[PDB]
Structures are given as structure tokens and as C-alpha cells.
Amino acid sequence: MDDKELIEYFKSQMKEDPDMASAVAAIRTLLEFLKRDKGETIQGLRANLTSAIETLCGVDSSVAVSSGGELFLRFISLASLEYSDYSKCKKIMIERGELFLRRISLSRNKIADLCHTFIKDGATILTHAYSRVVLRVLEAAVAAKKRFSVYVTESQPDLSGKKMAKALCHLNVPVTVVLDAAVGYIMEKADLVIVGAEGVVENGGIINKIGTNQMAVCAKAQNKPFYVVAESFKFVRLFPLNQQDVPDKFKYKAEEHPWVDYTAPSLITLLFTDLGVLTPSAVSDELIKLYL
Amino acid sequence: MDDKELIEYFKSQMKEDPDMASAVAAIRTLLEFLKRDKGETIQGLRANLTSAIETLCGVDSSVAVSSGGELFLRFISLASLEYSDYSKCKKIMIERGELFLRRISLSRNKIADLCHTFIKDGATILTHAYSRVVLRVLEAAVAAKKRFSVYVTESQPDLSGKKMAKALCHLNVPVTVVLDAAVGYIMEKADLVIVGAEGVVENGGIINKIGTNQMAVCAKAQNKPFYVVAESFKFVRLFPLNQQDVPDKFKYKAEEHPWVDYTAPSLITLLFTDLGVLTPSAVSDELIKLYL
Amino acid sequence: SELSERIESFVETLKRGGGPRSSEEMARETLGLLRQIITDHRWSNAGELMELIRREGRRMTAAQPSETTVGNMVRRVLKIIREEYGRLHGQESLHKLLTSAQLQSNIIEAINELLVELEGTMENIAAQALEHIHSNEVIMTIGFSRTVEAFLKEAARKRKFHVIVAECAPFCQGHEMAVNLSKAGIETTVMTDAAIFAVMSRVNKVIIGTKTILANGALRAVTGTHTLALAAKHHSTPLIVCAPMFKLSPQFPNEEDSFHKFVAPEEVLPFTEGDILEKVSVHCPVFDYVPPELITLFISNIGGNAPSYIYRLMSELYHPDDHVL
């Protein structure tokens, strides 16, 4: 199977379901490519899989795609750990990939059925950009018949904030669009700031939309709670020391306009993943446990 | 004149010399109104002046106009105390106002001469939006044959950061325009921060464009100095307690779009005024001495 | 003539090595020298006297900009001439903006009373010292400075407490304070710099001297003072600075970066190392810059003050025109 066919497969999988996460589509593409490969050697599988990983990363420079590819390759190694034969290995690959795909499909609802308990009635919600996870947890909170105010920033590079405002008005929720430079002026009226995560670094810091870091710093200044929601597959074995240390393959192609910022774990109150509610140390624990 | 030559004359003074601040134009218009007063009473003179204050505040409601009006009111009261007869005190009002205009017309040059020393060679300055005082200070620094870089935010509500970037690159200075949301990303490269001010509150905080506070807060997180350049006439006896305490006639009218916010004095390192280089606590003293 | 050669000897002593070690001696000598300058040199108007004083002070400051007692004493004298001329012939603020040949004896008596009041600054500081030390306190100092040693060794006449002194490496002169103060029965301790933070949790308050206090409230002190102030701020322990009034100088931190004073690297690294001394660059500054945010209080011969008020003392000591000198 050729790289081009992989590219249209990925793009079609994206377009058919706009609600699907990018990493989910990437994992599905990798699983389909593994399904039709006709390889014989596990090493041949690894080389082709990683090459397709860089191909998709070139297609989409998101951190989620690279994290999903790394998780996929570690899954390949885990499956091949205790299968000397290759055919049994391949069948287990397919079945465990089906289970993995269905679980990551249910992961968003799993996060929603747990995160909504923190939304105090009458509180104020602050969000940065168009994140599907925060929209789902707000839907869950509304389903529980709770009332709350929502402020959303505009995310200057691409105005996803207005799109989220439209999607929230579609659910009859009081929402207000505010400028990206007014976060501090709004930070006094907030009660808790929930935000999605593009990716999660080793110690619990978050790779996310460029405006996240200043909002986190301002919230820490006012000692307001700061909650971040992300899925399991967004974990990654990266570790920047500051904003500069972030690899350039994630900053751009997505004077100077980086699309990505890094937030330190010291400014994060809690994380909401399908595993549960986690301290920032739990992410590092999971990454350590996964890699022996 | 009566309510029609006021606004037209003020706009003419602003437009004929667009490189001259609103407060100076307002003070000059008040002096012109005093010249053509054609009335003989000190109480009536001050009543007409204080009415002119808000008929000018109807347009360009920035805090500088109100500060200049309050200064003019205090000046005319001070003069009255000194003398006794409206007849004789009129000419002395006129001459004192002429001398006041002459003294305040050199504020930019005095501030530039005082503040050019604070820029290092190879430094990296950070700026929020357009402010002629900052431009003059950087021109003075260039005249001192210095080498540095300048990062400027774009000031999303009205893209004046691009305007000042153009005016600065006209001077052959390496500049870089960044998003309002990228401040937290960018300042780690910045060596220090210099901003203007549209008004100085009692304690020492500033009253500036919407994004300024964020920078200041982030600056306190990064342990970087934060310098504010502003003239003497930008002082006012207003003390906001928080962001919502500043009067709403300044926030709006140049789904929730304010235009001006407040920065606490604790985040300010030094004030660079035509009165000298002051600590944030100094201003109150001066403003106390005006009313004792 | 004779005054000129005395001035040259003073300048040479400053350039080579400070004879009179105490800063108070520097202030007294500078004021006396200005006294003979005023009495001897001839002048008709005050302007020529002021410019002559400017020239002489420029020469003395250029002899050694590291210490500024001479400079701000000269500035105080210049303000004295300005005040006397204004009095015998006739402050920047918003109020000013909105509103608008026998002085030699007066100058001499002003300098004389300035010397008289300068004599007792240490005694006044000692007199007010007792109100900031309570029983069984824990005090930490740095380096050597006679003001704080007099402070503590007189305030212990009626109180009992513990004192920790950190040696100011490489010039381990904190040992001198330790010995002198233990010769008064204070139960002192001798410590290295590297342990400051290690013990900083168990200290109630920290009292230090200084070499020069800038206009913004930031000061220049011995090396390692900035680390001690940072540790104090981290543990939120109050920081007291004992400085007489003449150690207040009106310059600002960013001035040509001729702020520190670099001495021979022999103290830090002995010459006996040998070959490795070529590829290795060694720096031995003797002064550190403490920002005003880490300072809690200022104790002077006039009383207690806050750093945020320091600017006002600048207006009462130095005219704005004489900052450049």
C-alpha cells in the first residue's frame, strides 16, 4: 500500500467525522495500513509503520499525531514481546487494535461522565479555543441541569473561539466572546478555567494553543483553579525546559506566529483523562510504567 | 465659543499635528476657551470650564483628557488663591497657561534623555502597542548608537502595533510583530519590558490598553523589569480596587469588548516621567502635594 | 598650592589604596578638603565656585568610581551652596509647574554643622537600635561593617540573643566581626556563604550594612548580599539595612556597568595553579546589586524608613541638576 493512498485515507477519515480526534484518525489509518500490508517480518512492519508515521506527521504537524504514532509503535512492540511466531502476532495485533480503537472511541464519553461533577452551579467557566472535550463536558454538565456562565477567547490566529461560541449557543448556554488580550481583565470574574490539551508532556505540563500559557500564569496569580482535559493517547515522551525547547515541527506549519505553547505542571490544578482525575505526577508515572 | 467651536477646534488641533497627544490638545483647547471667555466671574469661569471638561470628554474619552482637565481646574484654583481680582488674575492665568504649555511640550525630550540610559546593548525590548513616548525613547537610544531587538504585540482590537512596527522599521531597527496571545511565549527572549500609559492612578499603577496587565503579570512571573513611560499630566485621583472598579466610561466606546484596563503598582519597577525617575509610590506624594 | 598638593595626595591615595578605611573618615576628609577649597580659592559669584567644585568632584570621582562617599558628599555641598544662594537672593513637582556677596561664612558654618551631625550618626543608630531586637532572637549578618557591630554589641547590653556571621569570601572579614563581637559575650557563630540558605529558615531577622544606596532603593553591598536577600524574601524574614545618611547616593543601577569593582583574581584562584590559568577566565567582583523589592526597612541616624520613601530623601539631599556632576 502506497503513501498517497494512506494520505487520502487519513483525509477521508478526518472529513467523514468532524467530531473525531486527529490522533484517533491517525491510529485508525495505521491500523488499516497494518491490516493490508502483506509483510512477513516484524522489523519490516516497524520500518513501514514508522515511515508512515513521519508521512502523516508531515501531512499534519499536530503533536497528537506523533503521540498516537509513538503509542502505536509501543503497542506493536508489546504485541511482539511474547509472540515468536508472526501469524499469531498479526492476529493479536488486529484484535487488540480493534479493542484499542473502540476504547479510544468511548474515551471522550468516559471523560465527560467524570469531569462534570466539578462544575458548581452558578459558577463561571473560562475556555481558550475550540476543544471538543470541553464542549462534551459542558454538554454533560448541562444535561445534569446545571447553570453556569462561560467566557471564551477568540484564539487570534484562527478564530476557533467564535466557532465554539456558536456551538455553545446551539446548546442554549450563556456564552461571551472576549479578546485574547483581555484574559487578565476577565480572570477576576472567573471561578475555574477548564481547557483542552493538544498534548501532555512528561511531568504533567500541557502542549496546547499558543495563548494558554499566559492564561495559566494569570490564573495562578489570582489563585484560581485551572483544569485541563485530555485523552490517554495524547501522552508523549517529550520534555521541553521552556517555550524555546519545543520542537519546531510542532510550532509552525499548523513575522513569527507559533501555533503551540507549553504550560508547566506547577500552574495546573488537575488533569481529567479517561483513567480518572490525575495529578501532574500521574502522567509521568504512566509514561514510566508503559516503557518498562 | 459655545459647544461647537470646542469639538471642532479640538479635532483641528489633533489633526494638524497628529504626532501630539490628546491630553495636550485638550489642555490647549481649554486654554483657548479661557482666552475667549468674554465673561467676568471666577465662579462662572470655573463652571464653564468644568462643563467644557465633559463636553470634551464626550469624544476620545481616554483618561488623559480627564487628567488634563482636572489639572487645569486645580491650576485655575491655585491661581485664584494667589491673587484676588478676576480682572487682574485673567492675564496671569493666560501667561501661566502659556508657560505651562511651553513646559509640557518638552516632556517627550526630557523623558527620552532620562530613559535612554536604561537600554543595554544587545538587549531585547518588549512593547504592547503604539505610544509616541516609547517611539521617542527608542529614537534617543538609536541616536546613542545602541544595538538591540524589539518585540511588539499586535494589539488585536485595533491593529496599531503593526503601525508602530512600520514606524520603527522605518528607523532601521530589527522588530518582530507577535500575536497578543504569544506574550507568554515571547517574553522569555525579552530582556526587559517598556510600555506607555494612558493615565496613572493614586497608588502608582497604570491605566493602559487591554493587554498591558497580562504582560505585567507574566513579567512578574519571569522576574523581568517592567518600565512605564508617561508624562506628568497623566496623573489622576482615581483608585480602582480591581479590574471592574475603573469607571466604565473608560472601558468601552474606544460580545464584551473593553478597551482599557488597570495594572497594580506592585508589578511596576520604575516610572519614567518628565518629573524624573520615580518609584511607583512617589506619584501619590506628588498628587497629594497638589492638593495641600 | 598646598591645598592643591593635598588634593593630589588624596586622589593618589584613592587611586592606589584607601588609607582611612572607615567610610566616615572618607566623608570627614572630603568635607574638610572642600572647606579648604572654599576658603582658599578665590571667586566672585557663586557660579564659578559651583563649577570649580564640579571640576574637583569630577576628578575625585574619576579617581575611583567604585566608592561614592566622595561624590555624594560633594553633591551635598553643592546643594548647600544652592540653598544658601537661594536664601540670600530669594523641588520639581506638579505644584511648581502649575504655580510657575558674603555667603562664605554661611557656607563654612553649614559645612561645620554638617560635620558635627555626621560625627554622631553611629551613636544615633546605636541609640535607636534597641527597639528592633527582642530577647532570644536569631540574627545573621554578612561581611564586616562597623555600624552593625556597634548596633549589636550595644543592644546586647540589656538583651541576650544569637548572632550568625557569614564570612564574605574571598575577603573573609566576617571572622573579624565574629571575634570582635564574641569579645563582648554575644554567643556568635562563624559560617560560610554556601550555607546561608541552608540555615536561613532558622533565622528570625537579618541585619546588614551597605556601601551605597541608590535612588530607587536598590543598594550595592558586599558580594553574596544578593543571595542573602533572595533567601530572606523566599523565607519572608524581615531584612534590616543599617546605613548612615551619607551612604545615600543619587545615581541609578544602569550607568555604564562600571558598578561592581573587580579585584585581582589571586584571591579566588592562587597563582600556584600554573598552566591552567591561561585557558581559564576568573572574575572576582567585590560588590553585588540588591534590588529594592527585597528590602524591608532602612535604619539611619534620623530613624526608620521604608524603601519606597527613599526617593524623597534624594530630593532633600541632592539637587536634580547635580546628578551628572
Interchain contact B124–A (C-beta under 8 A): no
Rounded to a whole number, what is the distance in Å from the CA of B271 to chain A's nearest CA?
22
Say what the alpha-carbon torsion angle B143, B147, B148, B154 is, to the nearest 10 degrees. 50
Please tell me what DSSP assigns to residue C20: S
Q: How far apart are CA C262 and CA B265, in angstroms?
A: 36
Terminal CA-CA length for chain B:
33
Query: What nine digits make up the cell of C125?
Result: 543608630
Q: How far apart are CA B247 and CA B26, in angstroms?
A: 20
Q: Kindly determine whether residue B71 and residue C99, on different chains, have CB atoms separated by under 8 Å.
A: no
Rounded to the nearest 10 degrees, the angle between the axes of helix B63-82 and helix B42-57 is 170
Contact, B63 vs B31, CB < 8 A? no
Contact, C250 vs C323, CB < 8 A? yes
> Which residues of chain B are at the C interface, by a Cβ-Cβ cutoff of 8 Å?
71, 74-75, 78, 82, 96, 99-100, 103-104, 117-118, 120, 232, 235, 270, 275-282, 285-287, 289-290
- For residue B28, CA distances in Å to A290, B35, B51, C132, C154 come to 73, 10, 16, 54, 62
Q: Kindly determine whether residue C216 and residue B279, on different chains, have CB atoms separated by under 8 Å.
A: yes
Tell me which residue has cell 500541557. A206
- Residues from chain A that touch B154, judged by Cβ atoms under 8 A, are 156
Please tell me what DSSP assigns to residue A235: B
Contact, C127 vs C134, CB < 8 A? no
Helix, coil or strand: residue A84? coil
The structure's method of determination equals cryo-EM
Domain ranges of chain B: 4-110, 111-290
Between strands A276-278 and A124-127, the pairing is unpaired
Q: Kindly determine whether residue B217 and residue A213, on different chains, have CB atoms separated by under 8 Å.
A: no
Element (H, E) at C23: helix C23-40
Interchain contact A243–B (C-beta under 8 A): yes
Element (H, E) at B33: helix B22-35
Say what the alpha-carbon torsion angle A176, A179, A181, A183 is, to the nearest 10 degrees. 10
Element (H, E) at B126: strand B123-127
| CATH class, A3-111 region | mainly alpha
Helix, coil or strand: residue B278? strand
User: Which segments of C167-235 are extended strands (E)?
Assistant: 188-191, 205-208, 212-213, 219-222
Q: How far apart are CA A88 and CA A79, in angstroms?
A: 10
Contact, A128 vs A209, CB < 8 A? yes
Contact, B7 vs B88, CB < 8 A? no
- Residues from chain B that touch C255, judged by Cβ atoms under 8 A, are 117
Interchain contact B261–A (C-beta under 8 A): yes
Please tell me what DSSP assigns to residue A16: H
Between strands A124-127 and A192-196, the pairing is parallel
Q: Kindly determine whether residue B184 and residue A217, on different chains, have CB atoms separated by under 8 Å.
A: yes
On the question of a cis peptide bond just before residue C253, with omega within 30 degrees of 0, the verdict is: no
- Residues from chain C that touch B74, judged by Cβ atoms under 8 A, are 98
Q: Kindly determine whether residue B255 and residue A176, on different chains, have CB atoms separated by under 8 Å.
A: yes
Q: How far is C-alpha A47 from the chain's CA centre?
A: 26
Closest CA to A265 of A200, A217, A204: A204
Query: What nine digits make up the cell of C227?
Result: 543571595
Which stretches within chain A are classed as H helix? 3-16, 22-35, 42-59, 63-81, 86-115, 132-143, 160-169, 183-187, 212-222, 248-251, 280-290
Contacts of C287 (CB under 8 A, 6+ apart): C66, C211, C220, C221, C222, C223, C259, C260, C261
A112-290 classified as CATH 3.40.50.10470: yes
| CATH class, B4-110 region | mainly alpha
Quick one: closest CA in C to B72, which residue? C98
Q: How far apart are CA A155 and CA A204, in angstroms?
A: 23
Chains C and A touch (3+ CB pairs under 8 A): no
Helix, coil or strand: residue B150? strand
Interchain contact B259–A (C-beta under 8 A): no
Between strands B276-278 and C138-142, the pairing is unpaired
Query: What nine digits make up the cell of C239?
Result: 531584612
- Residues from chain C that touch B276, judged by Cβ atoms under 8 A, are 92, 320
Query: Which numeric CATH code is attached to B111-290?
Result: 3.40.50.10470
Element (H, E) at B273: strand B270-273
Closest CA to C166 of C155, C156, C154, C175: C175
Interchain contact C255–B (C-beta under 8 A): yes
